């Protein structure tokens, strides 16, 4: 503080001005070709056509996800990195405890080619795998859509049904309960064992638990990010021998400890 | 050229030095705001002098990636999560064409498998959600099904349709008014006139939808969200 504080602050101002002027000169020498990085204009939640997404309290939405228009997401659900839920021409409804995994597209249609156009309905405790594409179809509760799979308009995935990873489910196809379909075009493969039904439920619950740690991390402020970066560096290695010489026991701070429900055991 | 590249390199040295000086000045004032991890994503990214040329009436979603020599025409639209990378060669998109969410339109990364083919997208073309176009030409008024992949050398003649989830092998030509689908892509049937009408009307409806999304994205950033993020505890 004080006079020395003020003098150093003023000298820092001069140095900053010089630095920014040098940056401008360097930009001029580049021929102005480099496009400047700007503040982020991506909006995680957006209105369109006076439609606002209705998202529950306990929903993980990755900052990189796009939730647009008339979207409803229920309790315990999770929208992961790169997901796009565009409800601009119709409604998208997501039940409770349902995960929509990375890079997935969910869209609707205003008017399909033939037949009654329907919104996109995804029920409770549904798992949708990475980079799936859901378009104007219905997924009922406790169903499983595999990663890379594609559901076209009018598709109904019934309760306790599975769509295999990478499948192309043609328009108006109905996957009945207890079966798994797959291939291109998607067709019946075999019945679902009870162990797989338990697997589906476990997948939904595990993703509910994963969403918590991801949501906690993504919502931290700049100060807390800095605090935890310093702590992480502090506790990255150890010298328990020198600690025993000092007679102390270094303990991992709780902000670096994950909950047991996400640990492999 | 080479002289431009040398000036670009020397320019980066002057910039590196200036930004280092600015950080010194902020450190003397006890500021650490430069340590904040902010996204360096650029909607339009240049690779030296290969920059994207985008028409003023073309909607580009902010989260989309347009890298290198990419041309987007009037009334066209690049939706959320799309990636267009023309660096080893060029990528051109015609007018009134919609490239839907999470689509990838790129050229071959290396010339190891021969000369790198550019990607040409015609006019009033529809490219479905999460489709992969790799060094292919797609003529005017064609329909690329969502989730479909087009490999290098492919030509989709005007009024051609590629079914959803199809895999069009390398150097395949899709004739006009034909619907091809499956892996590998094979002729399914002929295109009907109602579907041609749907092609054109869908390209028009998406141009109007692109306009609506462009107005909601150009709305000024809300200060209240900024203050809420800033004052978190």
């Amino acid at each position: 503080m004080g006079t020395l504080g003020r003098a150093i602050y003023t000298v820092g101002n001069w140095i900053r001005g010089t630095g920014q002027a040098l940056d401008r000169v360097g930009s001029l020498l580049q021929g102005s070709h480099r496009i400047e990085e700007h503040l982020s204009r991506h909006r995680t939640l957006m209105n369109v056509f006076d439609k606002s997404p209705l998202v529950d309290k306990d929903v993980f939405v990755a900052p990189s996800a796009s939730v647009i228009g008339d979207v409803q997401i229920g309790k315990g659900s999770s929208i992961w990195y790169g997901c796009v839920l565009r409800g601009d021409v119709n409604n998208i409804s997501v039940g409770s405890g349902t995960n929509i995994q990375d890079n997935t597209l969910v869209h609707v249609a205003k008017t399909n080619i033939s037949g009654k156009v329907l919104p996109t309905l995804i029920g409770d405790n549904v798992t949708v795998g990475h980079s799936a594409v859901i378009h104007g179809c219905t997924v009922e509760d406790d169903a499983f859509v595999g990663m890379g799979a594609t559901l076209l308009d009018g598709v109904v995935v019934e309760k306790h049904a599975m769509v295999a990873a990478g499948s192309l489910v043609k328009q108006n196809t109905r996957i009945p309960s207890g079966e798994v379909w797959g291939g291109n075009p998607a067709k019946f493969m075999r019945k679902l064992t009870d162990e797989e039904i338990v697997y589906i439920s476990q997948s939904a619950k595990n993703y509910i638990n994963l969403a918590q740690i991801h949501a906690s991390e993504n919502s931290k402020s700049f100060e807390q990010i800095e605090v935890e970066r310093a702590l992480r560096k502090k506790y990255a290695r150890k010298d328990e021998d020198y600690d025993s010489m000092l007679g102390i026991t270094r303990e991992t701070p709780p902000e670096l400890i994950l909950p047991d429900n996400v640990l492999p055991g | 050229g080479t002289l431009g590249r040398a000036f670009y390199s020397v320019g980066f040295w002057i910039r590196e030095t200036g930004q280092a000086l600015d950080r010194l000045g902020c450190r003397l004032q006890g500021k650490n705001y430069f340590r904040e991890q902010l996204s360096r994503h650029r909607t339009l990214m240049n690779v030296f002098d290969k920059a994207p040329i985008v028409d003023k009436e073309a909607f580009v979603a902010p989260s989309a990636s347009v890298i290198g020599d990419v041309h987007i025409g009037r009334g066209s639209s690049i939706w959320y999560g799309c990636v267009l990378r023309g660096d080893v060669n060029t990528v051109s998109v015609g007018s009134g064409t919609n490239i839907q969410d999470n689509s990838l339109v790129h050229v071959a990364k290396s010339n190891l498998s021969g000369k790198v083919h550019p990607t040409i997208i015609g006019d009033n073309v529809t490219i479905g959600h999460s489709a992969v176009l790799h060094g292919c030409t797609v003529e005017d008024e064609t329909f690329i099904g969502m989730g479909a992949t087009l490999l290098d050398g492919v030509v989709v003649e005007k009024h051609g349709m590629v079914a959803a989830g199809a895999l069009v092998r390398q150097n395949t030509r899709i004739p006009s008014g034909e619907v091809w689908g499956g892996n590998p892509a094979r002729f399914l049937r002929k295109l009907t006139d109602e579907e041609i009408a749907f092609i054109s009307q869908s390209a028009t409806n998406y141009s109007n939808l692109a306009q609506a999304h462009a107005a909601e994205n150009a709305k000024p950033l809300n200060v209240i969200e900024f203050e809420k993020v800033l004052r978190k505890k």
Binding site: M1, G2, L4, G5, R6, I8, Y9 | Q29, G30
Partner: peptide
């Protein structure tokens, strides 16, 4: 308006003193 960290300010003064002193040391030898 003012830099608060006193130890940082004293370190800055020490660094400046070292630089000016090295310059004087060359200039007078």
């Amino acid at each position: 308006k003012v830099s608060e960290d006193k130890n940082r300010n004293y370190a800055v003064v020490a660094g400046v003193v070292a630089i000016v002193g090295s310059i004087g040391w060359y200039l007078k030898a």
